[PDB]
Amino acid sequence: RGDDYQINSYLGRNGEMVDPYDIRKFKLWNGNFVFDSPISKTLLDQYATLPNEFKFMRYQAVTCEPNQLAEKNFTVRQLKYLTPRETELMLVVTMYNEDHILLGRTLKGIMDNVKYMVKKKNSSTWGPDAWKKIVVCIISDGRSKINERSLALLSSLGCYQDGFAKDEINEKKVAMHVYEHTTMINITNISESEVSLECNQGTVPIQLLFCLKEQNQKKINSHRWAFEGFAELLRPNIVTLLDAGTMPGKDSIYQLWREFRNPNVGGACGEIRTDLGKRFVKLLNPLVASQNFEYKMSNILDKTTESNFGFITVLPGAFSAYRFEAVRGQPLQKYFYGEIMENEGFHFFSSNMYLAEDRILCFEVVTKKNCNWILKYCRSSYASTDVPERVPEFILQRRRWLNGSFFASVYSFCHFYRVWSSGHNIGRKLLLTVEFFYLFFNTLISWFSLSSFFLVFRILTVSIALAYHSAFNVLSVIFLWLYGICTLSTFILSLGNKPKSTEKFYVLTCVIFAVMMIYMIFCSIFMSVKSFQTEAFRDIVISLGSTYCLYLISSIIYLQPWHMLTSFIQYILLSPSYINVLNIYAFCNVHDLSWNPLGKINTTEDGTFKMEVLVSSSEIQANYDKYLKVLNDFEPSYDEKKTGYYANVRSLVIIFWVITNFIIVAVVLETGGIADYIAMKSISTIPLMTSKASIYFNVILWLVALSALIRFIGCSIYMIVRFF
Amino acid sequence: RGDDYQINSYLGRNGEMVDPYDIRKFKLWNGNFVFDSPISKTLLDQYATLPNEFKFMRYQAVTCEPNQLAEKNFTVRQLKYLTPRETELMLVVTMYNEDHILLGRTLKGIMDNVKYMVKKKNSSTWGPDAWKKIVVCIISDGRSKINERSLALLSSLGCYQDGFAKDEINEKKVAMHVYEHTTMINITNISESEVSLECNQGTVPIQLLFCLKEQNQKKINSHRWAFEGFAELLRPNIVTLLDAGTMPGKDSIYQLWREFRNPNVGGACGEIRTDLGKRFVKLLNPLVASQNFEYKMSNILDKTTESNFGFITVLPGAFSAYRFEAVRGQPLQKYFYGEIMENEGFHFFSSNMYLAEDRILCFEVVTKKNCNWILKYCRSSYASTDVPERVPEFILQRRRWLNGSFFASVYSFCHFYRVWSSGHNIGRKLLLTVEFFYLFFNTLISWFSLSSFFLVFRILTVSIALAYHSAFNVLSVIFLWLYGICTLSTFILSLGNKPKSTEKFYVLTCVIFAVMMIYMIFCSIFMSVKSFQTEAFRDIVISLGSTYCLYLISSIIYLQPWHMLTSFIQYILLSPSYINVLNIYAFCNVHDLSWNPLGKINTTEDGTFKMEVLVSSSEIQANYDKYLKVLNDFEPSYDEKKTGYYANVRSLVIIFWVITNFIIVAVVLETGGIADYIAMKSISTIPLMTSKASIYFNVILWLVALSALIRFIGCSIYMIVRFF
């Protein structure tokens, strides 16, 4: 219940502004267009079952930059009550072209969370009128790019009416359209086809704020509007970022907000879950079960270990929250503009930080000067999303993730000295330095997976062929050729073609790699059993058993073990495709490159018409002299220069990746003519396999087991601390 | 001297059309715009030192398709005299954006040739008024793409005046602008900066015909306008194709026309020469001397051998001539449209023949049904052109040549049975079949050069390292790694980047390959000298000496030997770059892929304005119901489909090329795990080098010597027949 404000509709005959409830002449309010329309009586019929905010919707045409809304004298309904309304929590939802099911899921999760907070009993912050402290800001990116089933859902809530959007106002290009309403209707069911909207006494009001950008700038500009724009006016305590389609759990927003009672917390995130469908029906898809296992282990092992140190690298799908005072200043300046100091040319970090979009913020929050903000991971809050079910869209999704992670980790390692310019105490500074070193160690390991997988596969298959001879010779040669053909084809198709065009090939390549992994598992088991009936296979069995047991125990400690059997084998079988198809495509597509009027003739009936023709000899001579003159007096734009720089930097990364991996391959296996060279050196005074292969094979597995052990200790510490 | 016709200027007061020499009201002549403007008196001053064609210039706006000009009632000045003028020779010049120096060179060569023909004494065809039998048709491609220094040269000749070009006439888009004049001024000198134009009693008139297309369609459309368009009206005996910048020799057009006195000749071409500059100054550039040698040998060996059989594959720069009756019908239909029979989908040959643009015509002229046309090569006629002097533009030029040659040869081999459906006698049919088989043999050899060069280099360097041990071990390993790095980088940069962006790398790669070739030459000489002080190096010395001697003798027989010393070493040194840089880039770039208004606000002084607003409750309810309705009722265009097909077919060619070359590499050198496989097979019961390397090394050189011998016999037969 309860609202009020003073509207700006239009002027009548007396000239004193009049309300509809109580060709026309208007008046710009302070120089910019603000209009107040009533809503249809169909909504009023539910609403009655009445103050000013429920019955009007306010359109504003924002013609300025995000960082100038207040100066230009633009406002929001929250500031214009008799007592200005103070917001505790601003929830940002970003759409690009998402359909109404995804947006419906996000809004329904938000509405359920707000209802939970409003029904809270013993709280100083939340209570019966807690909905007044929450603003839901839906920033859609382009009118041309929005779906009409989303604008139809937004309209059905009461927060959109067409007709009074304007392209320009006093020769000023309108940059954005803002629709403001407070709705009493809630979403109660979202089937595969329909969204159930209903309004009764049990519903809670939601202060929606629909922003519609005029043209599609990317997501960083949406965040620019959210943080530099409306957050400056509303002054929220916490700013929460959600994507359309990410449905928060029933208490996730409250449980994340509860994380900020520690005054040192500057940001927080929760768990992101794969949405397995109805009765886990989607778990039959190997691509979906693999992703389910990957998400569960990224949350259980990686996030807890990072949160112990104090710096988290929030996962792309999960919804995050930042304390607004934490990000004001340097972090937002780095996030939106980049390293401002820059000459006409291009620098590596400054021109490439857009690849690591949100992971910059986190870094700058932790290493902020004279401030001891920490990032913290909340396991009590979760959000479930749908994952790609087809190989091409899976590849296209992970292209962004892998490039962002690689660049963010390189940037954080290269600039770690900032940890010591911040305001943390000495112990936290040491912990953060150790964590950044460990994260770069992980990045370095992930950079050499191309060689690691091939070396493990080739050593294993050749060793079994050497030892037992039966049909493993032919199998070794055949699998070498299959690997080579698939890898060459993946390189060529990712450098030149698009994944949508060739889907059968990518599916076939994934199947080939799965069969390869099955063969490697068989070889390992066979060699181990024969040895039990040498030392290297003792090491392989002990190390792999240990790394499986640590995963299982960490899942049990986290109290979420069911993914360790329903989804493990699928992930194991698709791991070679993660190494060999996702990484190649991600590295081959780093930057997403993209390389007078004369007159008219209209004739009359007779075929006649009139013309302006050079008739005087003098003007013909003039034109002739002007062309006789041209025969006597005898880098392009910034966009293509930036495109050239991006292409150079994308192609220098692939070459270095391939060469540095083949260096290790050639050192271990003595490829590259090295075995020839040693042979001919001795002749101056080739073997099948050396002891370098044994040493490397052991080292790889020990690294895997060590990483599992470190992450197990991290997760154990996380759970123990949280439980105490 | 001597012209006349009836002009179409405009209507005066009496209404009977009036001439300027003897806002106005006009009249479409037969429904289309034809205007006749006078020329400036500056030209008249030279001209006097007078009939109708010299003093007027005729603009026509062509709004129809090339194949419809006569039906739509468009004409040319040649048909409209009292006695219609019959053309013997139509010279087509195509520009895209060439500057005035290139066009000036072409026009000056043409003018000098016409002057030679007009001064001819004992000829039935040519005489004092021979200029009346020649029409020079300059087809420029796009108004936006033409240079202004070219339109200033064309205007200075009298064949262009601006002002009366029209975009549309009676709602018909004007497709092309035709300017017609007969000029008495000639070009007498073209320095680096100025073009010397002069008019006196020694000058010869030229019937120019400047076509200016409205928008840039590519060159095949220009030929479509020339052949299906103006050639249908003029009815020439011979149609000659020239590019802007190609300067014909002083008698080249007459000597090519002389080839057509044999009634069986359907086409002909002459020699194309590299323009070495002033006093051969450009011969200092290695890239230019290499091209000079390449052109001289392509003319001496390839063209004569082809001309003996009866089918030539005219070189891209050379100017060619077709007997018009020969190309009418099937050849032009295949050249312009492709295989007309085609479903909605894409077929290989039909959708890729545009890559082999002019080489289609030649094929269809020889294999025309019931006709015994032959193609013949004329050594008495030549044209000199400028060649690229920088590596990126050289690469970009050869991209087109290599793809065209490869596709044309594949097409000619696959469809050779048509030779037997033509009208030739049995012996010529056998000769043509043999020639097509030989040409496909050459194509097949050129497809495996990637493996041939590497195998020769690796066998040679490893053999010298094995035999003498001193520092050839290190050199072998170092050169293997240099080759690998350069090849991988070339693949990655040609698949992903543009040659303009990375010029230093391409120059460095060419230098690296030149040093590699120097090392290989040294190794061959060293091994041969040591053997003389085994049998394989006897074969190498005999075979390479024989293939050099045959080249030298063929150059002497042709009476053009000077390129065998001034330009030979440069070509030898750049040959690895031809194999390894031009071919990779050509194959990696086969197809040149390229992947509501709202309202406005203007306010008065008071800030007030008027609007159309939905005021009635009924219309707001209507809009709400129309959005509540959308929530209840719950492949792209041809261009991108063709782009996807082109990408698929371009990337399937690279993969097959690489795999089929590596198959040969792995068979000969036992790479690919094959030596491992044989070793472990024997263990079930690796060497440095095998005898396969010896056999392959001999075979490659014998093939080279055999090709030299065949081409020597061909050139000898050509010269002997011509001399008899």
Residue numbers in the entry:
A (entry chain A), B (entry chain B): 245 to 266, 375 to 401, 409 to 892, 908 to 969, 977 to 1015, 1025 to 1075, 1087 to 1125
Can you list sentences taken from the study reporting this PDB entry?
Chitin is a long-chain polymer of β-(1,4)-linked N-acetylglucosamine (GlcNAc) and is synthesized by chitin synthase in the plasma membrane. In this report, we determined seven cryo-electron microscopy (cryo-EM) structures of S. cerevisiae Chs1 in the apo state and in complex with UDP-GlcNAc, UDP-GlcNAc+GlcNAc, UDP, UDP+GlcNAc, PolyB, and NikkoZ. The overall structure of Chs1 reveals a dimer architecture with a twofold symmetry and is ~100 Å tall and 110 Å wide. Each Chs1 monomer is composed of a large cytosolic soluble region and a transmembrane domain (TMD), with both the N-terminus and C-terminus in the cytosol.
Using AlphaFold2 predicted structure as initial model, we built the atomic model of Chs1 in apo state into the cryo-EM map at 2.6 Å resolution. Except for the N-terminal region and a few short loops, Chs1 is mostly ordered and well resolved. Except a short loop ranging from 245 to 271 residues, the first 374 residues of Chs1 are largely disordered and invisible in our cryo-EM maps. SDS-PAGE gel of purified Chs1-ΔSL showed the N-terminal region has been largely degradated during purification as processed by trypsin, indicating the N-terminal inhibitory region of Chs1-ΔSL is more sensitive to proteolysis. This finding is consistent with our cryo-EM map of Chs1 in apo state, which showed the segment 989-992 of swapping loop packs on segments 245-271 and 376-379 of NTR. Interestingly, we found that two phospholipid molecules fully filled this cavity and were sealed inside by EL3s. Clearly, lipids play a structural role in stabilizing the structure of the Chs1 dimer. In the apo state, the path from the active site to the chitin transmembrane channel is blocked by the VLPGA loop, in which the proline ring of P675 is stabilized by packing with the indole ring of W760. Among them, L819 of TMH1, M886 of TMH3, F911, I914, L918 of TMH4, and F1098 of TMH6 form a closed hydrophobic gate, blocking the cavity from connecting to the exoplasmic side. In the apo state of Chs1, the putative active site is open for donor binding, whereas the putative chitin transporting channel is sealed by a switch loop in cytosolic side and TMH4 in exoplasmic side.
